[PDB]
Amino acid sequence: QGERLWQRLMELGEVGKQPSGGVTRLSFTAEERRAKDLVASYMREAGLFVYEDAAGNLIGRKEGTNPDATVVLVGSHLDSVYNGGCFDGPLGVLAGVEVVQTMNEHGVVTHHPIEVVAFTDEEGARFRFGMIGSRAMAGTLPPEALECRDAEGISLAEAMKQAGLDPDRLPQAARKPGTVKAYVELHIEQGRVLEETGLPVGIVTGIAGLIWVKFTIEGKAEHAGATPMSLRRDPMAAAAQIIIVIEEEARRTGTTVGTVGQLHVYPGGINVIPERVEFVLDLRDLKAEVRDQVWKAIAVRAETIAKERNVRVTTERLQEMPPVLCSDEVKRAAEAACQKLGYPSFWLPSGAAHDSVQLAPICPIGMIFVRSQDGVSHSPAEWSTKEDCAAGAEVLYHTVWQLAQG
């Protein structure tokens, strides 16, 4: 049941496998190269036409009955984070291949052509800049990104150069709007929503909007013994209260996620009230108006907490990504796909960002989620079951088939 797909996942999982069992494949390395060629051999087996674009993106084309028809794109990525799993990335790609090759084996024809794409560098690990391949196909790679360097200090442009890739030709990788019918990506959930409901497959409603705000809280460093409670300007105590406000305000909507996952304290002694505490709100929600409305509540409540406790709080916005709603054509297709196959229709937002987010400016997008065991992602523990991947490939298949009809 979903053998070929599972066998390919296990096999690809060997490429850059660590002693941990996890994987590490950075862009523009021999390992991702080995991976790209391995996936490419699966693309040939499926009867696809194989090429790489100007951004290093790997593509398999299956012609439709109208060579001039607009393209249905299915992909995901091959690169990983450092000690990553072997499902985040390849599921989408390998299921993509699985979908077309099934079609060719059973002599199934489609009006539109279907391209399976493995995008260059979604996770962003090597140059700390993410989603290089998909921005490129979308035509929104900033030249600021070419100047990013890795640990060994080689720049993206330099890496690209070494790889045979003239950064000058990067615009050639772009697809113009209206050459693409749509884009669909099968991905593991990366959370426990689906495992908690007890279902293998969900439909993505969209990719949540995001904000990173850095909180800097300034007080007065002072010896603990010397400083009565009534006199203090304790910014760690201030931080603790704000972190609670964050939780209260994210819980309130039923829809939002809010997290403080990093927090530095200055100076950092056991017996010293801190001078400064810095931390970063990670705050997301599918409706931007809700996200910001949530942020306003945190801001207003923080402002008073500041004045009450005689400390200074400045915030800075580090990153903003607007939400991307999934399209009705893709969603309606995945729903039909499930009903046909006897799966319940389960809707859910994608908290994390994906290559799909970078394709919205140029075509309608959509996504399908596969149950994630214990929600684990980006580590060796990452696991989706063979049958669950099977479930997701059937749906993908029937979602792609629909979209590629006239």
Q: How far apart are CA 331 and CA 364, in angstroms?
A: 10
Q: Smallest distance from the beta carbon of 245 to Co ion, in angstroms?
A: 32
Q: How far apart are CA 54 and CA 171, in angstroms?
A: 8
Decide if residue 247 touches a copy of itself (CB under 8 A).
yes
Question: Which has the closest alpha carbon to 330: 303, 359, 295?
Answer: 359
Site string for Co ion, 51-90 (x = CB under 5 A): -------------------------------------x--
Figure out which of the listed residues 208, 302, 311, 391 binds a copy of itself, where binding follows CB under 8 A.
208
- 321 interacts with, out of a copy of itself, ligand CAC, Co ion, none, CB within 5 to 8 A per kind: none
Q: Smallest distance from the beta carbon of 28 to a copy of itself, in angstroms?
A: 24
Binding residues for a divalent metal cation: 77, 88, 123, 187, 378
Figure out which of the listed residues 163, 199, 336, 353 binds ligand CAC, where binding follows CB under 6 A.
353
Backbone torsions φ then ψ of 203, nearest 5 degrees: -100, 135
Figure out which of the listed residues 130, 139, 375, 380 binds ligand CAC, where binding follows CB under 6 A.
130
Mapping DSSP to helix (H, G, I), strand (E, B) and coil, where does residue 76 land? Answer: strand
Backbone torsions φ then ψ of 303, nearest 5 degrees: -60, -40
Site string for a copy of itself, 279-308 (x = CB under 8 A): -x-x-x------------------------
Cis peptide before 267 (omega within 30 of 0): yes
Q: Which residues contact 298 (CB under 8 A, 6 or more apart)?
A: 242, 245, 246, 249, 258, 281, 283
Decide if residue 225 touches ligand CAC (CB under 6 A).
yes
Decide if residue 230 touches ligand CAC (CB under 6 A).
no
61 token code pair: 């084309």
- 244 interacts with, out of a copy of itself, ligand CAC, Co ion, none, CB within 5 to 8 A per kind: a copy of itself
Site string for ligand CAC, 30-69 (x = CB under 6 A): ----------------------------------------
Figure out which of the listed residues 164, 230, 342, 406 binds a copy of itself, where binding follows CB under 8 A.
230
Q: Which residues contact 172 (CB under 8 A, 6 or more apart)?
A: 53, 54
Question: Which has the closest alpha carbon to 1: 384, 386, 398, 339?
Answer: 386
Q: How far apart are CA 15 and CA 285, in angstroms?
A: 35
Q: How many residues bind Co ion (CB under 5 A)?
A: 1
Decide if residue 265 touches a copy of itself (CB under 8 A).
yes
Buried b or exposed e, range 334-372, using 16+ CB within 10 angstroms: bbbbbeeeebeeeebbbbbbbbbbbbbebbbbbbbbbbb
- Judge contact between 208 and 189, C-beta under 8 A: no
Q: How far apart are CA 305 and CA 381, in angstroms?
A: 40
- 262 interacts with, out of a copy of itself, ligand CAC, Co ion, none, CB within 5 to 8 A per kind: a copy of itself
* Cβ neighbours around 275 below 10 Å, total: 17
Decide if residue 271 touches ligand CAC (CB under 6 A).
yes
378 token code pair: 């980006």
Q: Smallest distance from the beta carbon of 254 to a copy of itself, in angstroms?
A: 8
Q: Smallest distance from the beta carbon of 387 to Co ion, in angstroms?
A: 21
Decide if residue 352 touches ligand CAC (CB under 6 A).
yes
Q: Smallest distance from the beta carbon of 258 to a copy of itself, in angstroms?
A: 7
Give the end-to-end CA distance of the chain in Å, rounded to a whole number. 31
Cβ proximity to Co ion: between 53 and 88 the closer is 88
Question: Which has the closest alpha carbon to 316: 217, 207, 208?
Answer: 217
Within residues 142-181, the interface with a copy of itself by CB under 8 A covers none
- 67 interacts with, out of ligand CAC, Co ion, a copy of itself, none, CB within 5 to 8 A per kind: none
Where on the chain is the footprint of a copy of itself (CB under 8 A)? 189-193, 196, 207-208, 210, 212, 222-231, 234, 236-237, 239-241, 243-244, 247, 250-251, 256-263, 265, 268-274, 280, 282, 284, 349-353, 375-378
Where on the chain is the footprint of ligand CAC (CB under 6 A)? 130, 225, 271, 352-353
